[PDB]
């Protein structure tokens, strides 16, 4: 629904690549089941498409270098309307009442939760400068460094660069990026931040109508 900067861009998918927010036109990303699907629209975390019946669903988009895919084993089912079991909607017939995922992003009753994200470990920050570990946080971003060499290091408030000469191996230090500013969905594939994390509600678009 809109791009990495945060301003409304018509049909564009926005994703996260290793901490950097990137964008790609929505016609460049394809998904499919047993047969190819057609994206109808997208809004926030949600996407509305026409899909045929399949035992799984994959999403693919190709960058200028590499191809990103993701297949999940969620059955997609095609539910005919009435007492004639078709597999593709007919060209002509009679009108019957049905419930379909509407193509509107307006705020109906449904909601999900947006929570405070947990710290995401990044091993690219840690380097070996002079036979000693060096943490170089990204431009204008904190990075909590935890190390278990001689003397435990819990050094949080570093913003520019630090050298922990106590630890001589990169494998015994962990640098966690801190964001604490933009609230992520309460997903189960992300670590949970400490303390109370519920920060708001996101309306669910494309509800059944």
């Amino acid at each position: 629904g809109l791009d990495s900067s945060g301003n409304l861009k018509g049909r564009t998918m926005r994703y996260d690549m290793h901490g950097t927010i990137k964008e790609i036109p929505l016609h460049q990303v394809s998904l499919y089941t047993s047969r190819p699907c057609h994206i109808v629209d997208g809004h926030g975390y949600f996407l509305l498409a026409r899909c045929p019946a399949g035992d799984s669903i994959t999403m693919e988009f190709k960058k200028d270098s590499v191809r990103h895919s993701c297949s999940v084993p969620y059955e997609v089912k095609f539910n005919p309307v009435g007492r004639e079991l078709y597999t593709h909607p007919p060209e002509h017939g009679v009108e019957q009442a049905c419930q379909v995922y509407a193509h509107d992003a307006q705020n109906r009753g449904a909601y999900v939760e947006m929570h405070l994200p947990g710290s995401e470990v990044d091993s690219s920050l840690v380097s070996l400068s002079g036979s000693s570990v060096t943490v170089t946080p990204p431009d204008g971003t904190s990075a909590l460094v935890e190390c278990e060499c001689g003397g435990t290091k819990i050094s949080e408030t570093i913003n520019k660069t630090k050298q922990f000469s106590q630890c001589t191996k990169k494998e015994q230090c962990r640098a966690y990026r801190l964001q604490n500013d933009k609230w992520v969905y309460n997903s189960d594939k992300l670590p949970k931040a400490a303390g109370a994390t519920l920060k708001g509600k996101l309306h669910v678009p494309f509800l059944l109508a």
Epitope: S129, G130, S131, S132, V133, G150, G151, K153, S155, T157, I158, K160, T161, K162, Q163, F164, S165, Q166, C167, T168
Partner: antibody, heavy 122, light 108 residues
């Protein structure tokens, strides 16, 4: 408890190398770095070099090349600093600096030597 | 590359005193403040630009604004007199440099 003690006062005529030894012990010395620095009397400090125990590699100051050399022995856990081609202005106070109580790695040097300021003592 | 620090400052007891330190790439590195007593080795007073080690009175504080790093002392008293040095790594970060030094003194 970090304790480094260096050699006593030694006065010597200009034109030859001076060897000052500072030995450090009382703390985990696997990879900690000890800094040689020279301060003129009543003037700013002038960082000279840094020595790593295990690595045994030193980056010399931009102003001093060749005439400064690094000597270190694990047996005494000591560093030996020799400064050849000494001049009249090169006679100054000397310090060996090292971390004492740890909240980080380098850049946090808390413990220092007593000093080796020297003058005629005949 | 060098750190520009005034030769000395004059402050009366009971009021805050400021020491300024400047560097071209300074907002990219960390500065550390050292207190040198008369005839004594320098002692670190402020590390990581904002905090003070244990045993250092709370009066000392540090602030960073891009090029300018300010060391602030609140309620200056008798034994606060000393030389203050801001030291930090160079742009290449391999070599360390020190400030000129401020002689904080009391006129009365």
């Amino acid at each position: 408890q970090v304790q480094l003690v260096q050699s006593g006062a030694e006065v010597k005529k200009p034109g030859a190398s001076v060897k000052v030894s500072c030995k450090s012990s009382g703390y985990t010395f696997t990879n900690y770095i000890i800094h040689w620095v020279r301060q003129a009397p009543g003037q700013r400090l002038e960082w000279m070099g840094w020595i790593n125990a295990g690595n045994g590699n030193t980056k010399y100051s931009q102003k001093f090349q060749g005439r400064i050399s690094v000597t270190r022995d694990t047996s005494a856990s000591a560093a030996y600093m020799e400064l050849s081609s000494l001049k009249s202005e090169d006679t100054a106070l000397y310090y060996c600096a090292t971390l004492q109580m740890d909240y980080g790695g380098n850049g946090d040097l808390d413990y220092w030597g007593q000093g080796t300021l020297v003058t005629v003592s005949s | 590359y060098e750190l520009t620090q005034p030769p000395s400052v004059s402050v009366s007891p009971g009021q805050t005193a400021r020491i300024t330190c400047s560097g071209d790439a300074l907002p990219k590195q960390y500065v550390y403040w050292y207190q040198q007593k008369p005839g004594q080795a320098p002692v670190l007073v402020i590390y990581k630009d904002s905090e003070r080690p244990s045993g250092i009175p709370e009066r000392f504080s540090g602030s960073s604004s891009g090029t300018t790093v300010t060391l602030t002392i609140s309620g200056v008293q008798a034994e606060d007199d000393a030389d203050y040095y801001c030291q930090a790594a160079d742009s290449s970060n391999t070599e360390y440099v020190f400030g000129t030094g401020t002689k904080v003194t009391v006129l009365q």
